[PDB]
Design a binder for this molecule. Sequence first.
Ligand SMILES: CCCCc1cnc(SCC(=O)c2ccc(S(N)(=O)=O)cc2)nc1
Ligand SMILES: [Zn+2]
Length: 257
Amino acid sequence: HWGYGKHNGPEHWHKDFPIAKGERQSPVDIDTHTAKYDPSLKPLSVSYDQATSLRILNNGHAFNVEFDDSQDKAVLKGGPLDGTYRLIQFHFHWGSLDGQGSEHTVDKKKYAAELHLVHWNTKYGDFGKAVQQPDGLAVLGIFLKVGSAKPGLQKVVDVLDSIKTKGKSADFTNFDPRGLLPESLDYWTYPGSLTTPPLLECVTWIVLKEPISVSSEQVLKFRKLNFNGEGEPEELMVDNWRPAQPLKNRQIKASFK
Ligand SMILES: CCCCc1cnc(SCC(=O)c2ccc(S(N)(=O)=O)cc2)nc1
Ligand SMILES: [Zn+2]
C-alpha cells in the first residue's frame, strides 16, 4: 500500500508506521555549518574487493543490487562504527527532474539522486535481526549529480530494461561496487532510520561529502523504470525519495575540516 504518490506517499506513512514521526528519522538536511568536526572519527574503511553481486531486482519502489552476505566479503568498518558491517544490497533514490531526487540534502541542496549501500552489523548474525537493533545497520550514502558519465554505473544502467516492472529480477554477477565511489571518503555521520517503511531506527548514516557524476543518459534510464507490475498501467519510477525529516535531538558530525 505505501508508495510515493499523493495518496500513499511519505506524508501518509505514519498511519501504517507510527515511527515515521519518531525521534531519529531519516533523511535529514545536513547543515554543513552546524555539523561538528570530530577529530576522534576514524577514516572510513571500505573493503569491497571480494564483493559478490548475485541479482538485481525491481521491488516496486526502487531497484536493489543484492550481494552474497553469507561471508565477510564486502565490509564497512572504521569511520564512526564499532565492529564490522556486511554489504547486503545497494539501491538509489532519484527524481523526475535533475533538480531533485536525493533524500539527504546539503544546506537545502537536493542532488539528482542518492545511492545507498546498505550494510548490517555482523554481531547480529543477519539483516532481519540487525534492523531490530539501534546499531544494526550502516548505510553509506553517496550523492549523484548530472554531468560526465560514471563508467562503473553503466553495467547497472544496461540491465534495467530487463527489470522494467515490479517483481522482475535478473542475474547480476561480478558487479564491482568500487566503481560507484567518489575519490574522497570524507563523510558526515548521524544516527537515523531506514528511509522507507518500516522506517526502523537502526541506521548509522555515513554520507559522503563528494558526489559522483552520472550522465543525463544514465539517469534518464533510471526514469524509464516502472513502479507498477507487468501488464499494469504505466507509472514511471521517479521521485522515490523521502523528504528531509526533523533533526530533533541529534548532532551531525563531520570527519573533515
Ligand atoms: C518491522 C518488522 C520487520 C523487520 C524487517 C524490516 N525491514 C525489512 S527491510 C527494508 C529494507 O531493506 C531497507 C534497506 C535500506 C533502506 S535505506 N533507503 O534507508 O537505505 C530502506 C529499507 N525486513 C525485515
Ligand atoms: Zn535508500
